[PDB]
């Protein structure tokens, strides 16, 4: 994704009127390319035991490639979501029991 900015300042229309655009408002400078940002990590909760990463019922951080294209399709992991998280809160409380 390219994040782009205008070279010429657009005037204001404040009442809820739409801005009055001229052709010179189509000249953009390129402020960012999202694809070039240092990339983040994905946080997951494992539903089985993965070889390197860890145990069933574990919170791990991987790179989005491994997470999107291996774990999530194979049902080897689920997202970090709160509703999905409380399931393993309960599982953690009923594991250490017996």
């Amino acid at each position: 994704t390219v994040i782009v900015e205008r070279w010429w300042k657009v005037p204001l229309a404040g009442e809820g009127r739409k801005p009055r655009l001229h052709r010179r408002h189509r000249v953009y400078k390129l402020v960012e390319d999202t694809k070039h940002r240092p990339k983040d990590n994905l946080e997951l909760v494992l539903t089985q035991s993965v070889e390197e990463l860890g145990v069933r019922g574990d919170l791990v951080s991987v790179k989005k490639s491994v997470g999107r294209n291996r774990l999530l399709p194979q049902g080897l992991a689920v997202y970090a979501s709160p509703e999905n998280k409380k399931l393993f809160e309960e599982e953690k409380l009923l594991r250490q029991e017996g």
Binding site: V4, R6, V10, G14, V27, K35
Partner: protein
């Protein structure tokens, strides 16, 4: 001479007459309001007011969306509400250099995605932004249900949504025929988005498709005048019999 009503309003008053009048109100109210799509390519400044750096004064400030072009092949996939940016640039970024037409195209990928509710793997062209939004909303089906019409931008997204919205309002047994366990389990997590049935089949519809549908529901072969005349005659005969 002059038109009595401005031509900006000819599209609107086109919808107040004829078959468009007989469309269900919730649909027309879903089309009426255009919510401002989430900023994708341009990056918005938060504040309404901003202090002018040169001037040292409080200055009113607005956000103006950057026109983005969606090629028709974007309607077959899900690009994450983004598209082609058509515009110009200065070379070297010196304002004094040549000014040149430039188009910024999204990077597209072939990825197969799994829908739980529809129980299927679609091969879809998506962007990295789409994958990040799916990640952020924690499910494919979530992402499709959880996002407004303006933010998906795809007709295919709206048809996915119409489909699984229908599957939720119906509680369709054919989802997982063998295991009602899985079925209830799945229908469970999505219970927040459940909407009635009359609403659910009109969600993803183009004005064309809508008009067509409504035309088909109204489809009737004109009633023979023999019927109508027979009913008038029975009315008259039953009021001639009851008067004596």
């Amino acid at each position: 001479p002059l038109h009595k009503v401005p031509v900006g309003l000819w599209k609107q008053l086109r919808l107040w007459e004829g078959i468009y009048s007989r469309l269900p109100r919730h649909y027309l109210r879903s089309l009426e309001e255009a919510r401002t799509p989430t900023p994708v390519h341009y990056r918005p400044h938060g504040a309404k007011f901003k202090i002018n750096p040169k001037n040292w004064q409080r200055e009113r400030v607005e956000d103006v969306p950057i026109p983005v072009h969606y090629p028709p092949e974007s309607q077959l996939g899900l690009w994450g509400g983004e598209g082609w940016v058509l515009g110009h640039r200065y070379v070297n970024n010196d304002k004094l250099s040549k000014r040149v037409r430039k188009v910024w195209k999204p990077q597209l990928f072939q990825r197969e995605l799994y829908s739980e509710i529809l129980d299927k793997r679609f091969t879809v062209t998506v962007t990295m932004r789409t994958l990040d939004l799916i990640d952020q909303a924690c499910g494919f089906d979530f992402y499709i249900l959880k996002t407004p019409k303006e933010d998906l931008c795809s007709k295919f997204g709206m048809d996915l949504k119409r489909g699984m919205l229908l599957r939720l309002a119906r509680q369709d047994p054919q989802l997982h025929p063998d295991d009602p366990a899985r079925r209830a389990a799945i229908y469970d997590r999505y219970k927040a988005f459940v909407i009635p049935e009359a609403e659910a089949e009109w969600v993803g519809l183009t004005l064309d498709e809508a008009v067509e549908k409504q035309r088909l529901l109204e489809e009737k072969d004109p009633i023979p005048l023999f019927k109508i005349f027979v009913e008038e005659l029975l009315g008259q005969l039953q009021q001639q019999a009851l008067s004596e």
